[PDB]
Design a protein around this ligand. Structure first.
Ligand SMILES: Nc1ncnc2c1ncn2[C@@H]1O[C@H](CSCC[C@H](N)C(=O)O)[C@@H](O)[C@H]1O
Length: 387
């Protein structure tokens, strides 16, 4: 019965086979999400984001009257935006153009309407009373976006707003226990367990997670892994995250902890090449400079038939721009031919770039008719290392 463990993990199910067999599970898992309610919450968060932007710009002395025109550079110097925050500032201006306050003409901006009096803290509280299940999202958005002017002026390190040493759980709850993240993280767990269901007893499985953070996605996977034949490598670029995850996950003795910067050759950071069966990357790969070189490093870690499980957001979101868009990773991208002005890719763009970086049999999840629009704005992508 035993066959050499040195040979590639051919027992791994194809991603397409995995999605076919998970189809009845995914159909019922999607229905657990309120379609009408998740949409109206998301819509209101996008409107509240406009009020945070206007409040911050007025705090920096925005005095642009209607008809007046300005370019990005002049407005940044006027408001005092530091050079490292201009790309975020440009996106904020783009948001104001989407709602009709501004208009984009060539590389110029024209003020169409005078922004009215806003009080986003008061409206955030009203939404908190109506949707207490979104308290983590509202509280994080209030803590981050209410210091938008200080971040734009380089006076406040936005990592101390998103990921302060004393509160890493708030941002974790967004990645872990939000309505949409509950579904996506469950898909991540079901995919991984289904792909390895034919694991021979005489063989161990090696999983590596990139950008695992505090372990929001990780917590869904660990309880289902067989500790006797699993090695799970928990990695993040930052040791503060692996340190916090090591405390949370003490019960699991098959976990290893190590730092990994996916933008640099992993084999120079103490990782074996082509020796991991499953790589998990939840909400991280977008925060890199070049997706092709990031995906080539990801592919470099996968065994010849290994599985890449990707969890990414696929659409622009105003309130996300006021939280994780404050951080440097949101604006690292320079592959402008692929990503002209935003770090995220949609389903079709991910499939194309994966097929160009050595991945095959690419599946995007979930794909159910009658699906809530919120589930269309994020995806779990499963792809196989090709050769
Ligand atoms: N270049 C890089 N290589 C590896 N990890 C990176 C990275 N740039 C940012 N990261 C990490 O990616 C993480 C994104 S937080 C993503 C959510 C996380 N998977 C969870 O569920 O909790 C951050 O913790 C950050 O430290």
């Amino acid at each position: 019965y035993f066959q050499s463990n040195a040979l590639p993990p051919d027992f791994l199910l194809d991603p397409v086979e995995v999605s076919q067999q998970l189809a009845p599970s995914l159909t019922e898992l999607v229905t657990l999400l309120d379609n009408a309610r998740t949409s109206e919450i998301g819509t209101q968060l996008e409107e509240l984001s406009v009020d945070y932007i206007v409040q911050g710009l007025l705090q920096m002395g925005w005095s642009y009257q209607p008809t007046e025109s300005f370019d990005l550079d002049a407005a940044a110097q006027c408001l005092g935006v530091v050079p490292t925050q201009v790309r975020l500032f440009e996106r904020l201006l783009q948001i104001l153009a989407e709602v009709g306050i501004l208009q984009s003409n060539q590389q110029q901006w024209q003020v169409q309407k005078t922004a009215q009096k806003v009080n986003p803290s008061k409206q955030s509280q009203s939404l908190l009373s109506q949707y207490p299940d979104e308290a983590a999202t509202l509280t994080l958005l209030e803590r981050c976006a209410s210091q938008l002017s200080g971040v734009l002026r380089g006076e406040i390190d936005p990592v101390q707003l998103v990921f302060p040493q004393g509160d890493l759980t708030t941002a974790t709850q967004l990645y872990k226990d939000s309505a949409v993240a509950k579904v996506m993280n469950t898909i991540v767990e079901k995919v991984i367990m289904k792909a390895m269901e034919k694991l021979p007893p005489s063989r161990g499985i090696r999983l590596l997670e990139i950008g695992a953070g505090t372990g929001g996605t990780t917590s869904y996977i660990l309880p289902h892994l067989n500790p006797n034949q699993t090695e799970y490598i928990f990695t993040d670029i930052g040791a503060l995250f692996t340190s916090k995850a090591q405390e949370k996950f003490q019960d699991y003795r098959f976990l290893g902890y190590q730092t990994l910067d996916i933008e640099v050759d992993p084999s120079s950071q103490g990782f074996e090449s082509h020796r991991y069966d499953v790589i998990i990357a939840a909400n991280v790969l977008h925060a890199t400079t070049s997706l092709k070189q990031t995906l080539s490093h990801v592919r470099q870690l996968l065994a010849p038939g290994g599985i890449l499980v990707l969890y990414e957001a696929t659409t622009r979101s105003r309130w996300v721009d006021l939280i994780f868009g404050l951080l440097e990773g949101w604006w690292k991208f320079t592959d402008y031919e692929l990503r002209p002005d935003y770090p995220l890719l949609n389903r079709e763009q991910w499939k194309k770039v994966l097929s160009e970086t050595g991945f095959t049999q690419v599946v995007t999840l979930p794909e159910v008719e009658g699906m809530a629009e919120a589930l269309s704005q994020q995806t779990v992508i499963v792809a196989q290392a090709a050769s």
